[PDB]
Amino acid sequence: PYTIELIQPEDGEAVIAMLKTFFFKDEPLNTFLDLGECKELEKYSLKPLPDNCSYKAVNKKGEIIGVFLNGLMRRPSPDDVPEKAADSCEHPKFKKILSLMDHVEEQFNIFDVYPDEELILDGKILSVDTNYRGLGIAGRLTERAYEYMRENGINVYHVLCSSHYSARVMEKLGFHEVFRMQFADYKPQGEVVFKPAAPHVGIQVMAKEV
Numbered sequence: 001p002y003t004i005e006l007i008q009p010e011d012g013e014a015v016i017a018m019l020k021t022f023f024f025k026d027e028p029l030n031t032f033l034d035l036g037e038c039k040e041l042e043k044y045s046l047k048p049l050p051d052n053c054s055y056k057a058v059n060k061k062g063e064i065i066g067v068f069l070n071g072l073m074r075r076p077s078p079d080d081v082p083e084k085a086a087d088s089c090e091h092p093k094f095k096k097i098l099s100l101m102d103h104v105e106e107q108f109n110i111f112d113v114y115p116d117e118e119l120i121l122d123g124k125i126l127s128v129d130t131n132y133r134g135l136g137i138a139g140r141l142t143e144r145a146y147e148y149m150r151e152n153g154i155n156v157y158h159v160l161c162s163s164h165y166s167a168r169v170m171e172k173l174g175f176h177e178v179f180r181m182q183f184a185d186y187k188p189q190g191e192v193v194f195k196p197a198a199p200h201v202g203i204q205v206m207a208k209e210v
């Protein structure tokens with residue numbers, strides 16, 4: 001028995017504590033790199049909270065057992081000055097992850113897919129406690145965002161998935177692929193950077209129009 005609630009600002013510490021136990025250790029790229037202590041990922045995770053569209057799953061005892069942290073993304077301005085997230089990161093392992101994100105954005109702009117949309121919801125960090133996996137919590141967190149989207153006239157939910165494992169969860173929830181890149185093909189300076197196990201196969205950007 002669990003509830004799905006809006007993450008409040010005072011929940012920051014508890015959200016980070018939960019993510020340090022799970023996501024920091026067990027998201028495929030984090031685990032592949034052995035991310036360790038990573039204040040930059042704490043910062044990255046906390047950033048979207050004041051957008052007021054991030055959700056926690058909470059068990060009967062009041063413990064956070066899952067989160068889906070979301071942020072609003074806005075179409076680049078006509079005069080936009082594009083920036084690389086990796087440039088401002090001093091943590092070498094997390095910088096590899098941000099550089100992969102920057103690379104995806106250089107190859108693929110979700111706003112090209114949806115020329116009429118000015119605001120899109122971005123699903124940034126999704127994590128469920130191991131003892132509560134396989135129960136549909138990721139789907140219940142995801143679907144709570146549809147309520148926010150309705151209330152605010154947002155049509156598109158965009159989620160960059162770091163493995164085919166998490167892309168399949170989004171597919172089951174009615175998302176479809178809009179971009180993919182195999183890890184075997186990500187060679188930004190001429191050589192492979194990420195070589196997780198075969199089943200992960202690479203990134204997939206997933207989208208749903210709700």
Ligand SMILES: CC(=O)SCCNC(=O)CCNC(=O)[C@H](O)C(C)(C)COP(=O)(O)OP(=O)(O)OC[C@H]1O[C@@H](n2cnc3c(N)ncnc32)[C@H](O)[C@@H]1OP(=O)(O)O
Nearest residue numbers: 026027124125126127128133134135136137138161162166
């Ligand atoms: C934007 C991003 O954050 S991308 C990165 C996404 N996050 C991660 O990779 C972090 C590590 N993974 C996790 O935290 C979780 O596996 C999640 C969040 C991806 C999925 O959460 P869940 O609430 O377990 O999702 P769900 O209940 O749909 O289960 C997904 C699949 O896991 C498998 N599964 C079944 N039981 C379990 C279990 N005990 N433990 C693990 N996986 C299980 C099944 O294949 C299941 O699919 P199915 O139920 O449709 O057959």
